[PDB]
């Protein structure tokens, strides 16, 4: 009834089967994932139905079953780690020196240059202490067409 803390995969069921559409993180009784992964669709856990409790389209984040409980924030110089729950692949941790997105008429936010499939969207990015700094899956394509994601946090 309380979702065990950890990384969960989002699975959608079609007439062609089950596919991992994305991932989220459970912490403190609430499920956190990227808004574009679910767009507010409800989840099910062992017959327990979860509905979105908060969402922000511009941050591309949505939470289920309570308020946003991920408190980690990037310091600006720590090496970061991406736990990548790619569809059909074993969970792997990848560490990187972060990139940066300078938004016009705004502020700085960190970014990670690691290219992972759709369905890895919502994977956690964490600092050396193991607290969650942001989620993965919202970013840009650069000149070589690789994907670069932002460390999406509230």
């Amino acid at each position: 009834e309380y979702l065990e803390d950890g990384i969960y995969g989002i699975f959608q069921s079609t007439f062609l089967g089950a596919s991992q559409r994305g991932v989220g993180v459970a912490q403190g009784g609430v499920f956190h994932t990227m808004w574009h992964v679910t767009r507010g669709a409800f989840l099910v856990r062992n017959g327990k139905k979860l509905v979105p409790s908060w969402a922000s389209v511009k941050e591309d984040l949505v939470a289920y079953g309570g308020s946003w409980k991920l408190d980690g924030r990037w310091d600006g110089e720590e090496e970061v780690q991406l736990i990548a729950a790619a569809p059909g692949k074993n969970v792997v941790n990848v560490q990187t020196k972060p990139s940066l997105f300078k938004v016009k008429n705004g502020g700085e936010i960190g970014a990670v240059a690691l290219d992972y499939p759709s369905g890895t969207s919502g994977s956690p990015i964490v600092n050396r202490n193991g607290e969650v700094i942001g989620l993965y899956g919202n970013g840009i394509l650069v000149g070589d067409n690789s994907f670069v994601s932002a460390i999406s946090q509230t």
Binding site: I7, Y8, V23, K49, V57, E59, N93, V94, S99, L100
Partner: protein, 39 residues
């Protein structure tokens, strides 16, 4: 087939031996109100 189902695949942690990859660079981008990022 009306909603999405959750499956646990692992737990959030920092692995000390984790493989390092990626490249560090600075990009200035625009952000729309719909959460879209563009260069």
């Amino acid at each position: 087939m009306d909603g999405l189902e959750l499956r646990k695949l692992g737990e959030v942690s920092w692995e000390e031996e984790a493989e390092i990859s990626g490249s560090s660079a600075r990009y200035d981008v625009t952000l729309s109100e719909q959460g879209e990022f563009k260069l």
